[PDB]
Subunit: 210 residues, 2 copies
């Protein structure tokens, strides 16, 4: 059985959980507090979470894990080129997440305020418009005209960015909203969103959309 | 034919070029100056380099490009799980480069001195010790006990980190030095390193090791 070791939040592990749920792959969701994490860190392959326990192996690096599990869940591409398109979409989403995190987690207040205008008005729209053009071209997916793990990465990124920015990020992006709907309509994803724990520190919870 | 569009230096494109060379995949290395880049940037899918031109497509995201090209060069894994081993190794190398780059390009000296201490004394040895245990276990490769694209990523990171730290980083990591040797011994990689342009901004050039 798979075991997902992570903190108690929809962080880098939420896409792992959602891909496992999509594939109906039975798994343990091991939610570790910060103190247990401090105790565990010297034993963690990179001193980092999340880790996938599989076949007795502790496997780090969430994106590599997501790509791996996507083969088991039929969320991967059929050929090298479909996989390249998904990888491109995932890395584009990760770039977006990184700029918004760089701003949001900036700690010098003066730099954070200066960075806010540029982050909210330029970077976020730039990347979302590129993804919007792709969503239009593929009939409501970010790649391959069908559900792929890129779309799960995108749905989880949407939730994360919504909590960081305190706004629905897709309000001006109707094709990305269709992507969102198409993925929320998938029964196993709906089930996961209903079953998963509520985090009261989250103001943006996808549970309110299902 | 492949085109690698990048600046005239061994950036994020060097692993792309070296993988193409390994496979005898004919390519033009289009080295664009910054002024040409200033004019060209609005036409780049992400306004960024590198880009692979292939079959009329401008494909961004170097790591996705490298993974795609690894299938063409017989540098990919034979199954999903070997690919997972390669991806995990690549992402660990990228994490090391991230910590060292965060230190090296910081311009406010106070954050820079502190980052020097923590980066050189903690992070770099930690990641090198991890990569070293894998290199020992796999007989002189970083993954799969055979050449993979992970080993090319590692060789290019070796060059980059050597230039940022101004030291041979593998002197105390004999199995990673064996990785380096094994990869530099590959005829097409040696041929590429011999043929490739000299960059006068590099103090650490692999040309001196072949």
């Amino acid at each position: 059985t798979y075991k997902v070791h992570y903190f108690d939040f929809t962080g880098r592990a939420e896409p792992i959980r959602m891909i496992l749920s999509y594939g109906k792959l039975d798994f343990e969701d091991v939610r570790v507090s910060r103190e247990e994490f401090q105790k565990l860190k010297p034993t963690l392959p990179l001193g980092q979470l999340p880790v996938l326990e599989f076949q007795g192996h502790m496997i780090p690096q969430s994106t590599a894990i997501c790509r791996f599990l996507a083969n088991k869940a039929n969320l991967s591409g059929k050929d090298e080129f479909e996989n390249l398109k998904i990888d491109v979409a995932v890395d584009t989403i990760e770039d977006l997440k990184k700029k918004v995190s760089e701003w949001a987690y900036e700690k010098n207040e003066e730099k954070k305020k200066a960075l806010e205008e540029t982050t909210l008005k330029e970077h976020v729209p730039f990347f979302l418009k590129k993804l919007e053009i792709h969503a239009e071209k593929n009939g409501g997916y970010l790649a391959l005209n069908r559900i792929s793990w890129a779309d799960i990465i995108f749905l989880c990124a949407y939730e994360t960015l919504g909590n960081m920015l305190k706004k629905d990020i897709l309000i001006d992006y109707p094709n990305l909203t269709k992507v969102k709907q198409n993925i929320l309509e998938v029964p196993s994803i709906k089930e996961w969103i209903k079953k998963r724990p509520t985090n009261p520190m989250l103001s943006f919870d996808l549970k309110s959309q299902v």
